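Slack export, channel: ligand-projects

TW: morning all. Re-posting the request from yesterday since it got buried. We need the structure predicted with the small molecule present, not the apo form. The ligand is zinc ion; the SMILES is in the block with the sequence. No rush, but it would help planning for next week.
GE: picking it up
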Amino acid sequence: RDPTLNKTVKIRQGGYKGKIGIVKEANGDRFRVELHNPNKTIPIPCSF
Amino acid sequence: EPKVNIINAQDDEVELMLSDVNLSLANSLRRTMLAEVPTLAIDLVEIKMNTSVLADEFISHRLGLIPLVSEDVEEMKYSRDCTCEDYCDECSVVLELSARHEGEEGTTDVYSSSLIKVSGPGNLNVGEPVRRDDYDQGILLCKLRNHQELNIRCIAKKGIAKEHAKWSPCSAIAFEYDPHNKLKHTDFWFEVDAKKEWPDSKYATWEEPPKPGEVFDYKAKPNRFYMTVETTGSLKANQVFSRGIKTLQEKLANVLFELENSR
Amino acid sequence: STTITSGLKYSLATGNWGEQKKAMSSRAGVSQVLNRYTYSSTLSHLRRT
Amino acid sequence: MNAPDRFELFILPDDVPKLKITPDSRVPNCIIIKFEREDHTLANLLREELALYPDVTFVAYKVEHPLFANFVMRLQTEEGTRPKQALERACASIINKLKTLDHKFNEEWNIKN
Amino acid sequence: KYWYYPEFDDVVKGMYLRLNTGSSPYKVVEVLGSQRIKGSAYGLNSKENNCDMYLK
Amino acid sequence: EDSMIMNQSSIDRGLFRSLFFRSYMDQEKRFGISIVEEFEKPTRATTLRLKHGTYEKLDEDGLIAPGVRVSGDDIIIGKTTPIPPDTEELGQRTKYHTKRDASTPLRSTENGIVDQVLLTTNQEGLKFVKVRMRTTKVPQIGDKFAS
Amino acid sequence: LHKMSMMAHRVKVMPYSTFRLNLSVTSPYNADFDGDEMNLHVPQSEETRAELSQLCA
Amino acid sequence: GVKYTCGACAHNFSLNKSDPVRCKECGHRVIYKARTKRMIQFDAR
Amino acid sequence: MIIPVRCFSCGKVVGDKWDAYLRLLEEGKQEGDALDELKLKRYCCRRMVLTHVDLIEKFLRYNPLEK
Amino acid sequence: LSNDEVNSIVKMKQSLSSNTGFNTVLKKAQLQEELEEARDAHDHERVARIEAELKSIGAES
RNA sequence: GCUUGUGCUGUCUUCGUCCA
Ligand SMILES: [Mg+2]
Ligand SMILES: [Zn+2]
Ligand SMILES: [Zn+2]
Ligand SMILES: [Zn+2]
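GE: finished. pasting the full token output, ligand included:
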């Protein structure tokens, strides 16, 4: 049941490398992660 | 055909005169130096403890604006172009700050000299905060009283001033041409007499004033440009000029490659 | 002791200058929330008629 | 909230070509070039370099909107010359000018050091 | 954390704890009781940790 | 038409940047001799009609902690009110709803960092909390300025 | 005040959080950019879309 | 289980959701929660 | 609140000159002469040091919330 | 702990309390209130003692 | 195989914003 929901995550690739966030939506292969650094939420692939 | 003549030279500013170039080339060079020369600046702040009276993001914004030595930033890679998971030593520089006030009286000032470089690229002269001298304390970051502590870990990345003004190596580029207005590129507002109501340019002695009987020359173009490049200390003035030229060359070469590969 | 206490507190809290059961026909807006947006605004509010 | 990311001014998406060329059939030997993630810095340089070539009869550019980082350039040469060759010649000539400028500045700086 | 409890007097009674002899070999002592001593406030852990409880 | 052009680099360097604070209040009400509200992290099992936000940022006592980034509709105060139980005691293994959610969500259009959480008692001796949220507002197209 | 205060425009999606107008239409709306706000209503049918594009444009 | 700080003497302690809301050593009625242990990161912009 | 790191208009670093400015004013130098001695030529930079109000000295007078 | 136990512990520590800035300010305020009460009662003897105590406690830095 | 969580008053009052 999407075990990574509401868990702290870090981005390793792309334009947001090394930013801490929290996973909000876990439909599939496209995770919505809110960023702690600015006040916004972005989509991101699971591999990232 | 182009010529360069240097008037004053310093570590932080150079005053030079360009000649036999188009106005567009000089302006593009000025724009490139202002907003397209890569430098190194703090881009992530991890705040492990902050009991000072300043907000966390207040101090983060202040830290991002501190200039860091960016001499060997060419060897460094962009964060988005590094295949390493997380940040490695080849795409980031880690600085750490730890400040505390001891005793129950007095106030402690936190300066940028307290930023200590922990990790970075091997043997590359990058990351150290810029200091005017060996005894210069640097930029004032915060103030602390008894039992207030600041403990942070900052990560510096490579970028350009287009993305954020903290990566700009230059402060203000004075730019000027045609002190005596022989080209009539500007029309002078006046009340009584336009000649005695307008201050002379600081380079007015470098060009012969027009003769009283001289007619207007419609075949003339701006030919000599006077420009002063001031830096924040992250890069020397000559380094800023040379790297602006190199960046412009790289941009044009990329356009040329795109054209040649289009067919 | 509740009479005076509740009457004063109600009139100062709501701004209706009168008894609680005679809210209609009473002069309203006498008491207002202090404006603390900036120092000048507070000073202006404290000297208003 | 609706503010775009600042890196979109210069970072090119994979699906977006850096340089798209389409002919302009209203007049002979004319092309329209669309530069992506560029601004006045490259555009003005190219325009004023090309304006001096005797075989280039029309060159212009415009930035449609300041909030989008791209510009479109119109070029139109004589009958003998293909416009893309003129654009390549302009790029190479400006590169040589910048190279000699850098060399002369280095010489002067070493002299006055 | 617990010396000011009213029941702490009976709680500490009979307990065995490590003691600094001072005169240092740590040894064990048996609590025969406690006695509050006014005017003998002492730093317990820090400067602010004033304590009047004493252990016999 | 009364617009103005602002320098983006000056905005980047801190011109006209400001700080925004908003506080939320909540308290435990007393409805009777033993009907009280409780500050707690409600569970999907023992409570009914929960808010659509997320409760994962609440601590054990039902209050968020300072330093935590919050977004719109997140729950910053967890409160439940008792409800007379139904006949679910028939065959439910203690998993029957006895409490109703009365949590306080963050405003939908606002987000920021939890700055300071205050816990105390009101005049009546019940619990009483105040949560202050902090964010930074940078000038952008549409902000109003004046000389 | 008058029927030129409601007119139908064509949408163009843009960044940032303000409605944007060509400045020639600020006269019929009696609007300037010192803080004014304006209302936008979306038609929800083909018939209504045709009415807006053919009458109120 | 969760730390707290007094509003006057700045004394750290903890509560068990059943103690009266009060500082143990000075009896102040106003206490504050302590900062979270999670990582806090900012973009320095 | 505290002296800005960079001048808003151009970007010169003025955050390291507050203490020197106060020291110069202490010795009796005039404000214009003090600003000139720090090599602040452009008036955009001069307004940053000239019109700065130091409020952190008032925030620091409140007893720290932790210990 | 109960409310009464908390009050007892607070009073015990107050007896142990050598000095605390918040408590010193509270004591000085209470002394000022007592002094105005004595002044309104025209008690010229108590007011002298309260003034002496206030002078001894004061002189902050 | 352990499976995901949908809902908000109302009435006064005041203070503001843009036109007028
Ligand atoms: Mg208006
Ligand atoms: Zn790397
Ligand atoms: Zn306390
Ligand atoms: Zn300046």
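GE: first-pass observations. Chains G and E do not touch (no CB pair under 8 Å). The helical segments of chain G are 46-55.
TW: perfect, thank you
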